Amino acid sequence: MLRKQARQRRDYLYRRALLLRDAEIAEKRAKLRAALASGKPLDPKIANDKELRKDFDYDVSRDIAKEQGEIDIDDEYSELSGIVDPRVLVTTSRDPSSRLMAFSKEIRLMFPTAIRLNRGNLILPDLVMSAQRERLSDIILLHEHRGTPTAITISHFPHGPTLMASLHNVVLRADITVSESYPHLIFEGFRTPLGQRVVKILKHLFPPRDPTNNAKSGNRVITFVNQDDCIEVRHHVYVRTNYNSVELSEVGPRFTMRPFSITMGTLENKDADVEWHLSQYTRTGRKKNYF
Amino acid sequence: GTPWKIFKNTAFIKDMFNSSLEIAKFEGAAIRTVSGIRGQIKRALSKPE
Amino acid sequence: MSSLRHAIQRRAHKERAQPLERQRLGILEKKKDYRLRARDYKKKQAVLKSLRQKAAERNEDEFYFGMMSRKGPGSALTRGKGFTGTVDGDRGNKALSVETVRLLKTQD
Amino acid sequence: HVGKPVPVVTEEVSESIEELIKRRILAGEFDEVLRRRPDMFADEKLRRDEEEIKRMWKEISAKLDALSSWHYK
Amino acid sequence: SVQAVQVFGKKKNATAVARCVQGKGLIKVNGKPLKLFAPEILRAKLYEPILILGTDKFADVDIRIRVAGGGHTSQVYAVRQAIAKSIVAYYAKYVDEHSKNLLKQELIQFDRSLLVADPRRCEPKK
Amino acid sequence: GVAKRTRKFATVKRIIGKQDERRKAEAVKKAEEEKRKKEKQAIREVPQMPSSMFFEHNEALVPPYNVLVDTNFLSRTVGAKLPLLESAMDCLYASVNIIITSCVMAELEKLGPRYRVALMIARDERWQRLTCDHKGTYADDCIVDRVQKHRIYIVATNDRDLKRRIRKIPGVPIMSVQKGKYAIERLPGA
Amino acid sequence: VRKLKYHEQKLLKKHDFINYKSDNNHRDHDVIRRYMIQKPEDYHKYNRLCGSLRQFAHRLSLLPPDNEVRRKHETLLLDKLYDMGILSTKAKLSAVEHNVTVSAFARRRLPVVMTRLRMAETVQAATKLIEQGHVRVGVEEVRDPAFLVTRNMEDFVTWTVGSKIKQNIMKYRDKLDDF
Amino acid sequence: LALQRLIAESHILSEAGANPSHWQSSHAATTGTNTRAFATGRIAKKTTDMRIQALGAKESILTQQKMPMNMRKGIVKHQEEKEKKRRQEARE
Amino acid sequence: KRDLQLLRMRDVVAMGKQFFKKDNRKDFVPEYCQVGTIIAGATDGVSGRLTRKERKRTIVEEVLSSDSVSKYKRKYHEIQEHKKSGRKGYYKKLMAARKR
Amino acid sequence: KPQKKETYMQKRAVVVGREERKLRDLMQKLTTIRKEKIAKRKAKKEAQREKLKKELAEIEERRREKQKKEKKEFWEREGKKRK
Numbered sequence A: 001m002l003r004k005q006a007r008q009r010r011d012y013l014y015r016r017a018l019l020l021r022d023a024e025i026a027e028k029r030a031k032l033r034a035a036l037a038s039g040k041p042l043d044p045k046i047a048n049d050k051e052l053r054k055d056f057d058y059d060v061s062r063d064i065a066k067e068q069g070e071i072d073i074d075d076e077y078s079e080l081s082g083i084v085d086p087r088v089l090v091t092t093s094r095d096p097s098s099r100l101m102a103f104s105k106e107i108r109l110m111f112p113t114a115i116r117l118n119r120g121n122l123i124l125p126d127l128v129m130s131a132q133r134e135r136l137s138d139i140i141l142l143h144e145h146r147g148t149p150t151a152i153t154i155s156h157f158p159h160g161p162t163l164m165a166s167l168h169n170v171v172l173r174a175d176i177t178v179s180e181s182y183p184h185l186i187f188e189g190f191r192t193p194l195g196q197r198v199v200k201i202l203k204h205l206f207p208p209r210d211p212t213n214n215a216k217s218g219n220r221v222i223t224f225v226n227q228d229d230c231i232e233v234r235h236h237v238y239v240r241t242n243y244n245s246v247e248l249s250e251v252g253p254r255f256t257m258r259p260f261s262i263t264m265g266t267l268e269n270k271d272a273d274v275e276w277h278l279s280q281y282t283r284t285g286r287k288k289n290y291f
Numbered sequence B: 001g002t003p004w005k006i007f008k009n010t011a012f013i014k015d016m017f018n019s020s021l022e023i024a025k026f027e028g029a030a031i032r033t034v035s036g037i038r039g040q041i042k043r044a045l046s047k048p049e
Numbered sequence C: 001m002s003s004l005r006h007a008i009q010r011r012a013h014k015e016r017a018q019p020l021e022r023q024r025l026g027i028l029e030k031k032k033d034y035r036l037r038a039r040d041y042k043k044k045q046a047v048l049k050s051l052r053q054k055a056a057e058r059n060e061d062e063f064y065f066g067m068m069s070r071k072g073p074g075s076a077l078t079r080g081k082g083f084t085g086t087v088d089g090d091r092g093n094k095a096l097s098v099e100t101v102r103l104l105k106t107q108d
Numbered sequence D: 001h002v003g004k005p006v007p008v009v010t011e012e013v014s015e016s017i018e019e020l021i022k023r024r025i026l027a028g029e030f031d032e033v034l035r036r037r038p039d040m041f042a043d044e045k046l047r048r049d050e051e052e053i054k055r056m057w058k059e060i061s062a063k064l065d066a067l068s069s070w071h072y073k
Numbered sequence E: 001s002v003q004a005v006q007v008f009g010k011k012k013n014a015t016a017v018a019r020c021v022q023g024k025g026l027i028k029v030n031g032k033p034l035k036l037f038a039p040e041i042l043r044a045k046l047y048e049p050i051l052i053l054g055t056d057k058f059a060d061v062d063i064r065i066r067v068a069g070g071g072h073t074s075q076v077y078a079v080r081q082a083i084a085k086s087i088v089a090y091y092a093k094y095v096d097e098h099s100k101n102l103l104k105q106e107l108i109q110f111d112r113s114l115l116v117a118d119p120r121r122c123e124p125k126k
Numbered sequence F: 001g002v003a004k005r006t007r008k009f010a011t012v013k014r015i016i017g018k019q020d021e022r023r024k025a026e027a028v029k030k031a032e033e034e035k036r037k038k039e040k041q042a043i044r045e046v047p048q049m050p051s052s053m054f055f056e057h058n059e060a061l062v063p064p065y066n067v068l069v070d071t072n073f074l075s076r077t078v079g080a081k082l083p084l085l086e087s088a089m090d091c092l093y094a095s096v097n098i099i100i101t102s103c104v105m106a107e108l109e110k111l112g113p114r115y116r117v118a119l120m121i122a123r124d125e126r127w128q129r130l131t132c133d134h135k136g137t138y139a140d141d142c143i144v145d146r147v148q149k150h151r152i153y154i155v156a157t158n159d160r161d162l163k164r165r166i167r168k169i170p171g172v173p174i175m176s177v178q179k180g181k182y183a184i185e186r187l188p189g190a
Numbered sequence G: 001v002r003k004l005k006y007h008e009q010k011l012l013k014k015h016d017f018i019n020y021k022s023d024n025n026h027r028d029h030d031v032i033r034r035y036m037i038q039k040p041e042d043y044h045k046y047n048r049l050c051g052s053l054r055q056f057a058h059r060l061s062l063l064p065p066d067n068e069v070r071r072k073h074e075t076l077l078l079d080k081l082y083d084m085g086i087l088s089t090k091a092k093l094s095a096v097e098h099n100v101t102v103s104a105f106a107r108r109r110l111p112v113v114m115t116r117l118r119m120a121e122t123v124q125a126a127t128k129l130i131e132q133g134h135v136r137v138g139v140e141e142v143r144d145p146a147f148l149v150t151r152n153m154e155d156f157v158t159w160t161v162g163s164k165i166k167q168n169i170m171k172y173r174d175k176l177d178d179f
Numbered sequence H: 001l002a003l004q005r006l007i008a009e010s011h012i013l014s015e016a017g018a019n020p021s022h023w024q025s026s027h028a029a030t031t032g033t034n035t036r037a038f039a040t041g042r043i044a045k046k047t048t049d050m051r052i053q054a055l056g057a058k059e060s061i062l063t064q065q066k067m068p069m070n071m072r073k074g075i076v077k078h079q080e081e082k083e084k085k086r087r088q089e090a091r092e
Numbered sequence I: 001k002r003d004l005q006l007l008r009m010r011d012v013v014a015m016g017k018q019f020f021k022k023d024n025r026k027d028f029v030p031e032y033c034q035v036g037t038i039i040a041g042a043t044d045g046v047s048g049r050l051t052r053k054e055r056k057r058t059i060v061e062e063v064l065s066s067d068s069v070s071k072y073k074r075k076y077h078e079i080q081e082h083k084k085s086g087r088k089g090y091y092k093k094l095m096a097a098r099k100r
Numbered sequence J: 001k002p003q004k005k006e007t008y009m010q011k012r013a014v015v016v017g018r019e020e021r022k023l024r025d026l027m028q029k030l031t032t033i034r035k036e037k038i039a040k041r042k043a044k045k046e047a048q049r050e051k052l053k054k055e056l057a058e059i060e061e062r063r064r065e066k067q068k069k070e071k072k073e074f075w076e077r078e079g080k081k082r083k
């Protein structure tokens, strides 16, 4: 088990390193193909590279599959992209408060296949060992300041990218029961490849959908939208009262979220390579949305 | 002002502002250490006014 | 240009020492001493990072033939108060037989 | 100042979010991940070449599973 | 060329070694004897393998126990596991193989936690 | 009868394998002999900085000036119609003895009877025939070997190859022919 | 056979008793000696499986490159041979064109993969241990030094049950237990 | 474009089998090197090599670069003897 | 072996008054050596001759017999005063200065 | 580990007097002055080496500009004279 997932971490990082080694031969090969097809200008280093022609003729068709969009990108997600139903735990900090366990109640109440554990006293490599053995395909962590929560840490398994994010502007459930259908994800403003990574680690966190009639069937919508790299999520229930009108309602936690870390490797990997963090205390770090 | 208590990245510093009102006026400010070490005023410590 | 620069435009600027109260506390680190403790700490944490990746990514069923001629680091229970995390080494001392100690004490 | 401030969400911002929701619902498009079916997978010269390559892959793939001593997929 | 057996015992964090050799009946836990360790109300749980197995099984051996970590309770369970595994292991290697199986039967018919420690994981319910 | 002789365990067949003698190449073996002779014979070769040099000034060249003549120079002065002793004499203002190596007369004779005038002006019996002994009959390496050894001579050449080759070694004059007269590069006299 | 003279060598230029051109620069037992292959017949067995596998890659790249039998047998060849363990990435058919190799088979053997897992120090020590029978792959005590280990069976390989080597490991680490 | 590939690649596409009237080409349709089960991609290799030679290449993969000089003089001598016989048979 | 060490270290002995051929080989002990003494030049017997209190037993005893031994110790305490710069007595003085 | 027990081979040895004591002291003081000596000498050779490679880097920048100007003027010449 542990030897399996350790060797899968190591083999995955090795194949990613071979992507970074073959980037230049990939762009050179794409200019060779596109300049075979389109027209006569071609660079004489490309035309003179004699290994590129043989390895070209062996490796044309997979770049055709990329341009067509056939094959899937090697990732911590697309091994089990939309077939498995991702079981997602939610936990808190060590001695949670009344407001914090209520907030845990409403965010497990936000995801459909989300189980909730009481914290108790559970050593964190037993969190990753426990979710490692009972295949919780995502856990999320919670942190408070005086019950009013201040962080979440989504982190998924066997070795997937954890995201650490602070937490602002939180309104809980007000005075008064919410459905659990497979929800409607919308994502607005994720323009960059870091936005594409955070959008992938949020859109593989929910149960997938059979693709026939997702456009009409279902009454629950979950909305993520970022202004100034501080994403938003609201939780609304809707009845489509016409063919050209719809009535929404705020159903749950009014939520905004400032991501400050995206670390590849799980919640225990406090030594593994980050891909992103807030660059505060640089001098032009407060003038950029994504990086 | 002078570092009063030194944690790893935070630091309680002293002898600089007179009151929590002044801290709150400067409660997002870019503060700097003459080692060339930037920092941010976060929040007024309560009892050591 | 360097020829188009004066001699007051080449004056060294003076580093300022501490106040006489803080002279108890020590040297004011300005940029040099900060870079010395920063590069030293980066080097230490780089070595500790490599060693944590060793201890995490070690193979429990590993076999070396030096284990038949060395004594391992043990644990806090097999070593007790005399536990550091390290493997002891050889000072070259040895239990010396009784004939040669008779030789050394005729000499003594 | 250091870093970014975090904005206070007001009613115009929240109702503009509601307008984004209503535009996506009515003009229904979503980023829900869709369920893939798991088991997804002259012309005489092309098909003669294809049948010879299928014969080659049955022979070679059997020999590879035999070298791995039936620890294949 | 001595008759020596090393044996461990476990609980939450208390780990205990016990070395059992050819002796004359003593059991000493961290130097002090066995009837002196582990404050009074749990020494019956210390004695449980002795008065299951009978002292006649123990009048030929010496058991030396070092205990580290944990609280008092976990040190008690680590000690009694080290006692039981110590005598089963000594009778495994030095006296005949039938008597091992008889001692395993007595200890297992009482409680298997004298031999196999089962540490608790958690239950993420479905 | 007797307990039989135990077999070994990890026995492999005896195959010839890399890094033998009889498989290894003869030029690699001569490279090993060269590395051993130059490892046993412990010599730190520092050639002496030549006598009569003061920081890239040869004071050892003084009139009567010696001048090694190249095939380039004999061709371009019989082409520029400019007599050799009188115009070297006229560009240095000093009595010269011109020296013509057997590599240089070898290369002019290898050039065919188009250049029989340049050969017949190159074999002037006034001049010092400087007999060389090396296998090549290649004039540019003969000249840089000779100048590198003694560093007295003035080298009369015109090619960018050899002029650029002996701008690298200090304190040597380069005599060229700029179509009406000769030229001297780095002799700090006239 | 003395070192031949000048005239005898140039009368014998092609001559050598040791290397022939048919001997393939003795690449056979460079790989045999390097990876402890106890039989040259097993070298050439792996060689011909390399040859058939690599010409299957050749005739995959001889198809027109939009074809579906190509776009499926590429993924099954690469995924089969990767999860086998011989290749190291599954995103390049040129990697089968020049990166499948009887040295890659031979380094996917058992004493090399447990040397690489540091079950021993060298391939000779690990080979000797797996001919004395201390190892297992999975549940079965493997005593074959040519047992090809696949990529997920490079996790379930350890010492057998009553192993003196394993008592030396727990004995070194000062944590054994005679129970 | 594609017509430059037509007129340029005509001795190879015509060398395969594609003219049943012509004697060299329909001899080459059942010669054996195109009745093997993999031929259109061999000729696709040669024509993509001709395309890169049109796109600014001086050397082909297809040629053997190193030969023992009597094989080589035999082959180049053989090509020159064939073309000399063809030009002495172009006086008909 | 002390004398051989002194012969790889003769540049420090003549303290700047005489510099030598820099001979940095790793193993300073040669394979073949033979410890001799100068006998006599038949032109120099007045000043070019050691006396009874100077025909000492080793080269190291000659260097110890010569002058500049307090110069050796002086340069040695320049070096020790620079190698006790900020090492541990310094930081121990800082800790006492703060805790006082 | 440091040994806190004086063993017998340490309780056995010969206490050596003033002459060999001072030969040891002189030999040590010479060896420390040698170590600081070579530390200085190789510090300054390292600095002069860094100046040498610095200005060699600048002169190879200027050699690169000679390469680009020469090839650019060439392909002006034959680049015009092929057309």
Ligand SMILES: [Zn+2]
Pocket (backbone or CB within 6 Å): F101, F102, F103, F132, F133, F134, F137, F138, F142
């Ligand atoms: Zn010559």
